[PDB]
Amino acid sequence: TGTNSDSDLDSIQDEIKSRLDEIDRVSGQTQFNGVNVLAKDGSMKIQVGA
């Protein structure tokens, strides 16, 4: 919106940057049984057959 001034844009940008960094944090931190599910692209095998 063009109504907002430069200070308003900076105040918005600070919060967006905080949210973006929080996204990276939540991505990195979560892990299951010593394995981070979201860390790397890969394939996880579930051996469901006897």
User: For residues 2 and 24, which CB has a smaller minimum distance to its own copies in the complex?
Assistant: 2
Using the rule CB under 8 A, is 3 a contact of its own copies? yes
Q: How far is the CB of 21 from its own copies (least distance, A)?
A: 26
Using the rule CB under 8 A, is 10 a contact of its own copies? no
Q: How far is the CB of 46 from its own copies (least distance, A)?
A: 6
Strand partners, 35: 32
**Under 8 Å CB-to-CB from 28, ≥6 apart: which residues?**
36, 38, 39
Asked whether the beta carbons of 26 and 36 are under 8 A apart, the reply is no
